[PDB]
Design a protein around this ligand. Structure first.
Ligand SMILES: C[C@@H]1CCC[C@H](C[C@@H]2Cc3cc(O)cc(O)c3C(=O)O2)O1
Ligand SMILES: C[C@@H]1CCC[C@H](C[C@@H]2Cc3cc(O)cc(O)c3C(=O)O2)O1
Ligand SMILES: N[C@@H](CCCC[NH3+])C(=O)O
Ligand SMILES: N[C@@H](CCCC[NH3+])C(=O)O
Lengths: 474, 469
C-alpha cells in the first residue's frame, strides 16, 4: 500500500547491519534464460537432470509449507523456480528464512539443477538463492498499465510483453536498412549535428566559440558535399531536430536516414523504395501484407499490401482532376493563388498563413490526394519546382521536378528526388553552393522517416510508442 | 584565379546557348572504376577488346591525334586513351570535343577496355559527354577542414582515414551484436559526467532542454527494464574547450552489460582493441607519429594483456608521499596542492580534491607507457560518483580507464546499484526498482580513430569539424 518502500529500505539497512550484503558485486552465471529454455524444453514431465548444477539469474515476478514457486523472467522469457526444503543446501542457512526475504521485482542469483514438474512445467530447482538487487517499490500487476509508460519506460518493458517487441522490431528495422545499403555498396558517414545554417530550427550557444549554432533539420547539404568529394554512394542514419509542434506523427527530435546515390535518378529511386519496403516487410513478416489498426485497438484494423509496384500519383494533375479546376503557371501568380484560396474556402479546409503558393499546394494535396489509398503505399510525384528548391527540374514537364513522396496510411515516410546539380540553376550555405561549383555529378537522393516506418510495422498510433524515452512535459 | 571561373562560367552559358546540356539528367553507366580494374587488369600490353562497348563515369584529374587522361572513381585511377581512330565523328569533331575537357570535370565515357603498348590500363572512348563541369581550379592547411571534398579528392590518404573510421565503427557494431548486444537510441535532449552542457529552447513546449553529455543514465534504466545487453553509438555534446584532442561534439559508444563487472570489462577491452587492430593491419603493432610526420614515429603494441596501474598507489609511489583518507580533508588537499607547485604544474581552479587527483594522475601516471595501451584502475569514490565501491579497498571504486599515448579512450566500471549509496530524479527512481549487478563501458570513437589512422588531431578524423567562420 505504497509504504512498502520504507519497509523494504529498512530491511536492506537491517541486512547490512546483520553483515549481509544485499547488493553483491558479481554473481557468475553460467547460462541465460533464453538459452535455458532452448536447452531444456525437451525434457519429459517430472524429469530432473539431477547432476547438472547451473548458475542462473532473473527477476522474480510472482512469489507463489516446505516448498515455494516463483516466476523468473530474463530477456523477456520466464521459467519457474521450484525451491524445496529437501533440496536446499542447509549449510548456507535456514531455508524458510532465506525465501521469506524474496519479493516480487527482486533480482536473484540461483544455483540449481534444470528440471520439469509433474504438470510438465519447465523449471529450475535451487540449492541456493542469493539476493543480487532488490526491488524497493510496489511493482504494478500484470496488465496494470497510460503516461507511466513513457516516463518510466523500464516499467513498460518489464510488465507489458508487447512493449519489448516494439523496440526489438525497431532495431531489426534499422539493422536491415543498414545492411540493405551496405550490401549495395553504400558508405556510412557522420556529419555535424550543429551548424551555422524548410522548418524552424533549434538554437543553442557554443561557449568556446561564443557563437549561436543551429541544430540540423536534415543531413542533405553535407551529404551532397561528400558526393562532390567522390564518395559516390553515401548515407547517414541519425537524429535531426525540428522546432515545430508535437502530435501522434510528430516529435521535435526524430530518426532519419538519407542517402545519396551518384549517377542515379528519380526512376532508380522509385525502384529502390519499392524494393526496400517490400523486402523489409517480408523480412519481418514472411508476407508483403500486414494488419494495421488505423483507427485504434478498439476499432477494426485495415490491411496494407506492400507488394510492388505501388501507385504513382502526380501532384498537379490529380488536384486539377479532383477539383475540375486548371492551375495556370506560374503557380505564384495572382490569378492562380487567388484560385487556390477559393478552393480551400469552397471545400472549407483550414487555410495556411501566410498563403504562399507552395504552402497552398501542400494543404490542397493534403486534403485531396493524401487519403487516396490506405490499403497500399503510394507515391505522389513530380512536385512543382516552387515546392522543391533543391530538386532537379523535370526533364520533360516544365515547372515540375523529378520528386517523390511515399505515403503509408496518409502519412509521409519517404521523400526523394533527382538532385539539382547545376550551380547556375540554384537560385542555404556559402560552403554548399561553393561545392556545387566544383561539380556535383548526376545524383539521386532519398530520406526515410524511421519512426513513422517503425509505427506502421509495429502497429502503433502514436510516435511516442516507438521512441524509448519520448520528450515529455514534466 | 577568379578568371578561370569566369571563363568556365561562360563556357557553360555558351554550351547551354548552343543547344547542348552541360548538366544532363542521367547517364547509363554499366561498370564502376574499381570494377573496371578488377575485370580487366590481366590484359596483355597493347591488347584491346574493341568489341566490348562499356559505359563508364568518373572525374578527370590529369590531361596529357591522341589525348591522354586520368579518370578517378571511388578512389582509383584509370587512363583514358582517346584515339582519332575510335572517335565517332558523327557525334562531334574529335578535337572540338576533347579541347573543352579540363581538370576536375566529371564525364561519361562510352568506349572499350584495353592497355597501351606501354602496358598501362586504359579506357578507349568513342564518345565523351560532359556530365558535370568543375568551375574552379583544383589545387595540384585550413582548406582541408573547411572544404573536405577537395581533401578527399587530392590527398589519397584522406579517404583511407575516413574509410578506416567507418570500418572501426562497423567492427564495433558487429563485435557487440555478435555478443548478444542490443543497439538503441536514448533521447538527444534532456531536462538535466562532470562537463558543461549545451542548452537550447523548445518553442512549442516552452521549455529549456540540455543536450546529452553522456548516454549512461538512460541506458542503465533499460537494464532495469530487462534489456541486459544494451548499447548506443551516437554523438554527445560537451560545451567545453577545443583542441587537437577535444571537440564540443564527439562520437561515443557506451554499452551496458548486466551480470558483468570490472574484471569482465578488462577482458572485453583487451579482447576488442587487440582484435580490432589485428582486423585493420594483420599485426598487433602499429606505428604512430606522436610528435608529427616530420619527427620519428613510436610503435604501439596491442598484444594482450595490457598493464593495470592503480591510480592512488602510483601517484603515492612516484612522489614518495602518502595521501591520507578522506582525500577531501584539509590535510590531504594541501599535500596535493603542494606537489602541484613543487613540480611546476598548472593548478586547477577550483582546486577540489577530485580535480587535484585528476591533474596529479594526468602528469605523474598518464605517460607511464607509450609502446602499449594501459589501464588506470581503482579510482577513489570522490572521482567516481556512478561507480560501485571497490570490494576490498575502502575509498576506492571498481573503475578502469584505458590510455593510448597519454590520451584517454576508454572509461568503464562496475555500476553502483544500491540506490542508498548514490548519495536525475527519473534515473534515481529506477535504481529503486532494482538494477542488477552490471558492468558498463564507454569509448571515444574519434580518439581511437586518431590512433589507428596515425593522426595528430581530432579534426583529421571528423568529416566537417566545427570551425570559426
Ligand atoms: C526526413 C524524413 C523524410 C521522409 C518523411 C519525413 C516527414 C516527417 C516530418 C517530421 C517533422 C517533424 O517536425 C517531426 C517528425 O517526427 C517528422 C516525421 O515523422 O517525419 O521526414
Ligand atoms: C565518453 C567517452 C568515454 C571514453 C573516453 C572519452 C573521453 C574524452 C573526453 C572528451 C571530451 C570532450 O569535450 C571532447 C572529446 O573529444 C573527448 C574525447 O575525445 O574523449 O569520452
Ligand atoms: N532532406 C529531405 C529528404 C531527402 C530528399 C532528397 N535529397 C527531407 O527531409 O524531406
Ligand atoms: N558515461 C561515461 C562512460 C561510461 C562509463 C561506465 N558507466 C563517460 O561519460 O565517460
Amino acid at each position: 500500500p505504497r509504504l512498502y518502500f520504507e519497509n523494504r529500505s529498512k530491511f536492506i539497512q537491517d541486512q547490512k547491519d546483520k553483515g549481509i550484503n544485499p547488493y553483491p558485486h558479481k554473481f557468475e552465471r553460467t547460462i541465460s534464460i533464453p538459452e535455458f529454455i532452448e536447452k531444456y524444453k525437451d525434457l519429459g514431465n517430472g524429469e530432473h537432470l539431477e547432476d547438472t548444477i547451473l548458475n542462473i539469474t532473473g527477476r522474480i515476478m510472482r512469489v507463489s509449507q516446505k516448498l515455494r514457486f516463483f516466476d523468473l523472467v530474463g530477456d523477456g522469457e520466464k521459467i519457474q523456480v521450484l525451491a524445496n526444503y529437501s533440496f536446499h543446501n542447509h549449510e548456507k542457512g535456514n531455508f524458510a528464512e532465506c525465501y521469506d526475504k524474496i519479493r516480487r521485482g527482486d533480482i536473484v542469483g540461483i544455483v540449481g539443477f534444470p528440471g520439469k514438474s509433474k504438470k510438465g512445467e519447465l523449471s529450475i530447482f535451487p540449492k541456493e538463492t542469493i539476493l543480487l538487487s532488490a526491488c524497493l517499490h510496489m511493482l504494478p500487476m500484470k496488465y496494470g498499465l497510460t503516461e507511466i509508460r513513457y516516463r518510466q519506460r523500464y516499467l513498460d518493458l518489464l510488465i507489458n510483453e508487447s512493449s519489448r517487441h516494439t523496440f526489438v522490431t525497431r532495431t531489426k528495422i534499422i539493422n536491415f536498412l543498414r545492411n540493405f545499403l551496405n550490401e549495395r555498396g553504400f558508405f556510412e558517414v557522420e556529419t555535424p549535428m550543429m551548424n551555422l545554417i524548410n522548418a524552424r530550427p533549434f538554437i543553442t550557444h557554443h561557449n568556446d566559440l561564443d557563437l549561436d549554432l543551429y541544430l540540423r533539420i536534415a543531413t542533405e547539404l553535407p551529404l551532397k558535399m561528400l558526393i562532390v568529394g567522390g564518395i559516390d554512394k553515401v548515407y547517414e542514419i541519425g537524429k535531426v531536430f525540428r522546432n515545430e509542434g508535437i502530435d501522434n506523427t510528430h516529435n521535435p527530435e526524430f530518426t532519419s536516414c538519407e542517402f545519396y546515390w551518384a549517377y542515379a535518378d528519380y526512376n532508380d529511386l522509385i525502384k529502390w523504395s519499392e524494393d526496400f519496403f517490400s523486402q523489409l516487410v517480408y523480412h519481418l513478416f514472411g508476407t508483403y501484407k500486414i494488419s494495421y489498426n488505423k483507427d485504434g485497438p478498439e476499432n477494426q484494423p485495415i490491411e496494407i499490401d506492400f507488394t510492388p509496384p505501388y501507385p504513382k500519383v502526380s501532384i498537379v494533375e490529380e488536384i486539377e482532376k479532383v477539383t475540375n479546376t486548371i492551375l495556370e503557371q506560374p503557380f505564384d501568380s495572382n490569378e492562380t493563388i487567388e484560385k487556390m484560396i477559393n478552393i480551400i474556402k469552397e471545400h472549407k479546409i483550414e487555410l495556411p498563413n501566410p498563403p504562399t503558393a507552395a504552402k497552398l499546394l501542400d494543404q490542397l494535396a493534403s486534403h485531396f490526394i493524401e487519403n487516396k489509398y490506405n490499403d497500399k503505399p503510394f507515391f505522389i510525384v513530380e512536385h512543382p519546382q516552387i515546392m522543391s528548391p533543391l530538386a532537379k527540374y523535370h526533364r520533360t514537364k516544365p515547372g515540375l521536378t523529378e520528386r517523390l513522396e511515399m505515403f503509408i496510411c496518409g502519412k509521409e515516410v519517404l521523400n526523394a528526388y533527382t538532385e539539382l546539380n547545376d550551380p547556375f540553376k540554384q537560385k542555404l550555405d556559402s560552403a554548399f553552393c561553393t561545392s556545387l561549383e566544383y561539380g556535383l555529378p548526376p545524383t539521386g537522393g532519398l530520406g526515410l522517416g524511421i519512426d513513422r516506418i517503425t509505427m506502421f510495422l509495429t502497429n502503433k498510433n502514436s510516435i511516442k510508442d516507438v521512441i524509448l524515452f519520448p520528450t515529455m512535459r514534466p
